Amino acid sequence: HMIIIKLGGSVISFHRHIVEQIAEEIAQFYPDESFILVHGGGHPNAREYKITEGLVGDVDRKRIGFSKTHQAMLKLNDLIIQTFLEKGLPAYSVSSSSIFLLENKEVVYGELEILRKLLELKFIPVLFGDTAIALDKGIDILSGDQIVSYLAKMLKPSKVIFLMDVDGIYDRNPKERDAKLIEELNVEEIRHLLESIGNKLREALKIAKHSEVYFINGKVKENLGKAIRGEKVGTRLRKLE
């Protein structure tokens, strides 16, 4: 009984009111429910220093920007952590680039014993999309979707909840005209959509092999509780069989 919740980069950006709403919803299940939290950037230094290119060209500048981008990520992570703390929840920050190693944007080495111990002692670990050491490229950007995929394979949570700007995975483009919400997502529908973001839809296809997946609107407070309890909300991709 453990639930991973991924906060998109756009729902938290700082949007303290929505973080307070997520914390109040999580408080309805703590501590009779283990929770892991992952959030994203809200990004400037990563593009400015070309982290995804790797350790090539001006390597000294890339190492400085690698650290600067990590320090910025820690500052935003602190904003989220403090908000959770004044709401009574023991959120504890875990540095992603301290426990993960990348190859081809994917985690190929991980340390998970501290996360396990944090959950066992009724803590709420909070990771973030981060800069990360890459075996193939020296340095790379580890996205939140990759952390969630690796955690899903290893810790096998009961479900993974994506908080997005829209109500879920839509038929056409969400901000279009005649777009319908896919309340029940199956794998063939996912492959239907990937031919015509697709990155997290691919990660969702991987995660579904291990856990139930929800795509919900993180701006509506009650959606998080509806997804945690299993009620109808947004888009739901059941565990594969």
Ligand X SMILES: O=P(O)(O)OCC=C1CCCC1
Ligand Y SMILES: Nc1ncnc2c1ncn2[C@@H]1O[C@H](COP(=O)(O)OP(=O)(O)O)[C@@H](O)[C@H]1O
Q: Which of 18, 40, 66, 236 binds ligand X (CB under 6 A)?
A: 40
Is 202 part of any known ligand binding site? no
Binding string, residues 22-61; x marks residues near ligand Y by CB under 6 A: ------------------x---------------------
Kindly state whether residue 185 participates in binding ligand Y, applying the rule CB under 6 A. Answer: no
191 binds, among ligand Y, its own copies, ligand X, none (CB under 5 to 8 A by kind): none
How far is 217 from 76, CA to CA, in rounded Å?
Answer: 21
Kindly state whether residue 129 participates in binding ligand X, applying the rule CB under 6 A. Answer: yes
DSSP secondary structure string for all residues of 24-86: HHHTTTSSSSEEEEEE----HHHHHHTGGG-S-SSHHHHHHHHHHHHHHHHHHHHHHHHHHHH
How far is 21 from 87, CA to CA, in rounded Å?
Answer: 10
CB of 54 to ligand Y, least distance (A): 21
Q: Closest by alpha carbon to 76, among 26, 42, 48, 49?
A: 42
Q: Which of 48, 165, 222, 231 binds ligand Y (CB under 6 A)?
A: 165
Is 172 part of any known ligand binding site? yes
Say which residues have a Cβ less than 8 Å from residue 168's Cβ, sequence separation at least 6.
181, 182, 183, 215, 216, 217, 234, 235
Kindly state whether residue 218 participates in binding ligand Y, applying the rule CB under 6 A. Answer: no
Q: Tokens 């350790």 appear where?
A: 55
Kindly state whether residue 200 participates in binding ligand Y, applying the rule CB under 6 A. Answer: yes
* Site size for ligand Y (CB under 6 A): 16
Kindly state whether residue 197 participates in binding ligand Y, applying the rule CB under 6 A. Answer: yes
How far is 55 from 185, CA to CA, in rounded Å?
Answer: 39
43 binds, among ligand X, ligand Y, its own copies, none (CB under 5 to 8 A by kind): ligand X
Q: Which of 65, 125, 144, 168 binds ligand X (CB under 6 A)?
A: 144
The piece of 24-32, 69-77, 96-104, 163-171 that touches ligand Y (CB under 6 A) is 163-171
Kindly state whether residue 196 participates in binding ligand Y, applying the rule CB under 6 A. Answer: no
141 binds, among its own copies, ligand Y, ligand X, none (CB under 5 to 8 A by kind): ligand X
Helix, coil or strand: residue 187? helix
Strands (DSSP E) found in 129-181: 130-134, 138-142, 159-164
How far is 225 from 77, CA to CA, in rounded Å?
Answer: 23
How far is 79 from 128, CA to CA, in rounded Å?
Answer: 12
DSSP classification of residue 134: E
Query: Which positions make up the binding site for ATP?
Result: 6-10, 42, 165, 170-175, 197, 200
Query: Which positions make up the binding site?
Result: 6-10, 41-43, 144, 165, 170-175, 197, 200
> Which spans of this chain sit near ligand X (rule: CB under 6 A)?
9, 40-41, 43, 46, 69, 73, 129-131, 141, 143-145
